[PDB]
Amino acid sequence: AEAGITGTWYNQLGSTFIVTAGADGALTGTYESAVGNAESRYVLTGRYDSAPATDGSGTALGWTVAWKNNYRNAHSATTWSGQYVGGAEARINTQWLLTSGTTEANAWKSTLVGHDTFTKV
Amino acid sequence: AEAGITGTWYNQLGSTFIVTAGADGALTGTYESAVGNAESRYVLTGRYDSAPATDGSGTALGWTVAWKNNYRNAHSATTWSGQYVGGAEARINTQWLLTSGTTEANAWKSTLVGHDTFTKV
C-alpha cells in the first residue's frame, strides 16, 4: 500500500483527491470537488493501517475533509472509511458520513451516508 | 422475544410505535410521530429472527415505515435495523436509514443515518 496510495484518485461524480501516504500511517493531501479552481480544494487528513496483511486483503484507511476554505464555509465535515486494493485496477472503496452543524432540534437529521469508489483513471 | 416485543414502545424524541410480533417472524403495527392525532400514524411492517439464541443475545429485527398516510406524503421511507433485549429494562436499540425520493443529481444526498433506542416506559 503506502506507495500504491500516494497519487491522484478520481471518484464517479467528478471529484479528485491527491494524497501522500507517509511511512508511519499518515495521509495528507487535498480534495477538489469540481470546476478546476482553487476554490474547490479543501485539505484532507487521515490514516491508513502501514503494515496491512500479506491473503490479498485490502489496506484499511480513512480521511476527513472539513468543508471550509477561503472561498466557502459549508459548516460540515465528511469522513470516508474504506480500503485500498492495488493491482492492475487499484481502487479505494469507501462508505462516507457527512455531518452538517445543526441546532439541537435538527441534530437527528444532521448526517448523510453514502459510498464512493475511487480509481487512478 | 415475540411476546416481549408486542406492545407499545417510545423512543427518546417522543415517537411511539405499537407492534404485534406474529408466530412466524412478522411485525405489523403503526408508528406515530407526535401530537396524538391520526395524522401522524403511519403503517409499519417488518420481521424479527422467531428463534433467537437461548447466551443472553438480543433478537435481531427490522421494520420499515413509508411516510405517506391520508394527511401527509413526505416522499420518503425509513428502515430501522436493531435488536430487542428483554428483562427488567427491555429496549430495542436501532440504527436507521431515511431515504427521500430525489432526482438523479441529488441522489448522492438522499439518505440520512441515525439511531434510536425504544423503551416500554
Partner: peptide, 8 residues
Amino acid sequence: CHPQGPPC
C-alpha cells in the same frame, strides 16, 4: 450545491 457534490 454543497462542495462535496457536482459542480461547485
